Design a protein around this nucleic acid. Structure first.
Lengths: 34, 78, 105, 97, 93, 102, 80, 107, 94, 34
DNA sequence: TCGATGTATATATCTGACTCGTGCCTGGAGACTAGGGAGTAATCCCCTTGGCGGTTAAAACGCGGGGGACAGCGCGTACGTGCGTTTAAGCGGTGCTAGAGCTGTCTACGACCAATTGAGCGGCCTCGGCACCGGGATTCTGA
DNA sequence: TCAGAATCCCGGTGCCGAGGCCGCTCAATTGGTCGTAGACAGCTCTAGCACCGCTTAAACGCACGTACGCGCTGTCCCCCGCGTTTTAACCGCCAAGGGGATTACTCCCTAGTCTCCAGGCACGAGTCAGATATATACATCGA
């Protein structure tokens, strides 16, 4: 699903398993799996 | 160099935590947890030092990042 | 003639009210000109995201009016938005329906 | 010869490492890991870390890891085992997060 | 009586803009009011702390950007900075 | 006659009660408990309670109890059990203590 | 009949059902009542302190909101 | 003009009062500040500092050492019912942990 | 030379020589005392500011600090803090 | 165990079992238990 | 695998609050002084190399075995579940008054400020707690 | 119970960090205006509490059943405990300049105010989901 802004809305991920989103100085998200 | 945190070091941390018996798969999980914690703290510290137009991250930025994250740190800061 | 600062930047949220709140809220000695408009833009974007999610949830429920249940369903189903409101409870919002697979026979 | 039964050396290690208060991770590897993470985050701009900047980060990381391991072992002993298993860390991170 | 200012007209305007044929009841609307106030408090407090830490007495446009970077996570932060920069650029003209 | 198996009725209760948003505790007894606790704290002074304050307090208490029971059942499932036990609540409160207690 | 007995067993069962709990032990209810009592004690003490500071002899719904916000659990829908 | 007496001397306190008053005004907490608020705050701070220092000194003496160290501070803080709650979310540099081996593991 | 940096080291030392006259203090412990004092001061001042703002006032009096102390300290610490603060302000008034 | 102020310092209590320090309007501490 | 027994969704069918609408204040738009940042500039210090290197204390690899622990089978009890009472919640209307809430109005109070002057920083420096050097001890495990 | 071996006590030595000392310099005290914030009275009116009747859901008992938790296989496998080889962390060390950090300075952008005016806030008026009756595909135990 996409918003009118354009970002991808995603269901919550199991952070306790290590799954995490990578941010940077460019604020570019990067889905990372555990 | 996440392998720099050696296997005996995790054993020592567990021993300081009252842990008597450790599995064989604990070390990778502990390395991942340390990596994510460091990622968050370093992100906040880098943002803090970027706002000040500085190029060397000081201990004060680390302390402020830890305080914002939720864990206050005493000692360092002067 | 009179031109509202909210309309100059194409912002639905007010700029004068935000500037007054910043000045009267004892946040700092002085506030710049761009701080209220930046705050208004950020607030409007966040409100728009909340309202998109809430409206989609309401449409999925065969309704036309947004209610706390819809706001709770929309907020807790988006990861980037659940983290921001992680420590917040919403009145009459219920819970996300889930039953762990072990219980299911 | 002489050979202690398994387990009786863990208790001695626990007491020895709980009495003292030094750091339990070597300085250079942790500093290199921190610098690598900062370099990856900043994307190519070199950043200098103060002498006390690394020490504070190491202290915080050590304290957090020790407390998390305490919680995980508490979870295991609730689960009626004396061994720290990977699922225990996940449960501890889920309940307090 | 006494005037009770709130973010009412603006919330209804945004709802009209983004969903042309829906309305919001009273309870959800008060929830949105509280959410807006909470977010404003968070951003303003973070900006004030950032201004004080560097020994400055002004909340410029820069401070709010760094506060948004610190608080909002990931894509929300990126889009918020982009939209705020667009808004201030439009206002300066 | 007809008789459902033990367990297949609780699932229907779970599905029904995760769908609605109405309060689950009776309103008047909760108000009485709140008044008693307030009177005991204030040492005999009669404090009046607004109609909205009791509702807000009840909402907060119900949400807190629901979250605590969720965590307790998480612990119970971790311990290879399907039954909630008193030690599960104690463990759940211990893992998220002074930081999450207040 | 003690007031804390007003929170009956069916109420705790319904709360657990909303919490996803399928099977409940017979000793849960007393522990749940104790937890509810201590939470209510903390929140009510903070609210009464907030009210007494304002020189008011009745507590409002806003004071409970500040009490909950200070304790750590922000509440939405009652003014802030 | 006569002789000058510090507000700390007038109130019988060791912690400064003028410094606390200045920090209250410069910190952007309110438009105006009263006259007894710095005295009240300084008294509270002095009481807390005295409590912490007395407990730390007792812990140091129990170790036959005449100098207070962060280990002594941690031992004093973590052994109190209330002082632990006041500093629950705080990590002290070079403090270690409380010696606590649970009875299940002991053979 | 250098810039003056303010700290509560001297006052913490003065309090130390009142409860244990023969005991000294290290430097890391002095830093920890400085950090703890600053943290508690920030907590009390922030709570006082919030309490003043909620009542539509613009003055932080002793009553606000007293209520903040009652809110931020558990039990015996709170009671003794209120008692000592009231004693100090009463002695100051004369 | 006492202090100069006089508060009964003891090892920390186990809040998870219901032990707590009740505080009234006059700030008189009442030690509670599970 | 089907009968049907509770059932919780879909199908049609009457009714009170949200969105209209309009007074009308009270809070938003413009010129001009003055202190706070921007840009600049010699200075020194501390941090990261780029190396020195050596030494010695962890780290890694390997092997033996002893105790966790996971799968699994038995008993009994207790918490789930359906059916007949009775007990206190919920709804509605009265009513009385405690107490919030807005207005008037001065008076004690704190901000603002020139002028001193002493408390509190910085840099120096001895000596004594303290860590380290080396020498006898009680507690765990095979016989 | 006897025999290794790790730990704590005990005394002697050298060290570097911590209490004072001296010098100095900003900021806090004294003393005195001057607007004004709010403490005190006064009044209105508005919700909060107590009560009376009427209509309905928890409490307590009773019969299955399946969850679970010691106890014994059982067994097996994997994580300590120790030994031997490897390696790299760390401690003194030259050095040197990039960037923090000064001072330390010098020159350009927002707050308060008075004048003007419109846009949100409060107070009336009209229906969609709430509730009421079928009904109906679900689904689920037991033969």
């Amino acid at each position: 699903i996409y918003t009118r802004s354009g970002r991808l809305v995603k269901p919550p991920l199991s952070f306790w398993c290590g799954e995490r989103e990578f941010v940077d100085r460019e604020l570019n998200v990067t889905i990372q799996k555990g | 160099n996440i392998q720099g945190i050696t296997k005996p070091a995790i054993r020592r941390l567990a021993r300081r935590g009252g842990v008597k018996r450790i599995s064989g798969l604990i070390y990778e999980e502990t390395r991942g947890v340390l990596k994510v914690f460091l990622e968050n703290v370093i992100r906040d510290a880098v943002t803090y030092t970027e706002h000040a137009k500085r190029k060397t991250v000081t201990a004060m930025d680390v302390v402020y990042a830890l305080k914002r994250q939720g864990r206050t740190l005493y000692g360092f800061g002067g | 003639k009179a031109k509202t600062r909210s309309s100059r930047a194409g912002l639905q949220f007010p700029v004068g009210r935000v500037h007054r709140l910043l000045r009267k809220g004892n946040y700092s000695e002085r506030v710049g000109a761009g701080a209220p408009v930046y705050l208004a833009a950020v607030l409007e974007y966040l409100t728009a995201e909340i309202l998109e999610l809430a409206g989609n949830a309401a449409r999925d429920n065969k309704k036309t009016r947004i209610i706390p249940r819809h706001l709770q369903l929309a907020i807790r189903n988006d990861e980037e938005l659940n983290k921001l409101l992680g420590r917040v409870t919403i009145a009459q919002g219920g819970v996300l329906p889930n039953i762990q697979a072990v219980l299911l026979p | 010869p002489h050979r202690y039964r398994p387990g009786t050396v863990a208790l001695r290690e626990i007491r020895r490492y709980q009495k003292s208060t030094e750091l339990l991770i070597r300085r250079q590897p942790f500093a290199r890991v921190v610098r690598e993470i900062c370099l990856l985050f900043t994307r190519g701009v070199d950043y200098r870390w103060q002498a006390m900047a690394l020490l504070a980060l190491q202290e915080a990381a050590e304290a957090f890891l020790v407390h998390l391991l305490e919680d995980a072992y508490l979870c295991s002993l609730h689960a009626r085992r004396v061994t720290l298993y990977p699922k225990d860390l996940q449960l501890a991170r889920r309940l307090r997060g | 009586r006494s005037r009770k200012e709130s973010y009412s007209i603006y919330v209804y305007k945004v709802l009209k803009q983004v969903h042309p044929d829906t309305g919001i009841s009273s309870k959800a609307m008060g929830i949105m009011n509280s959410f807006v106030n909470d977010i404003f408090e968070r951003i303003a407090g973070e900006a004030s702390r950032l201004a004080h830490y560097n020994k400055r007495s002004t909340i410029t446009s820069r401070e709010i950007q760094t506060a948004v970077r610190l608080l909002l996570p990931g894509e929300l932060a990126k889009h918020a900075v982009s939209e705020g920069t667009k808004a201030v650029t439009k206002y300066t003209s």
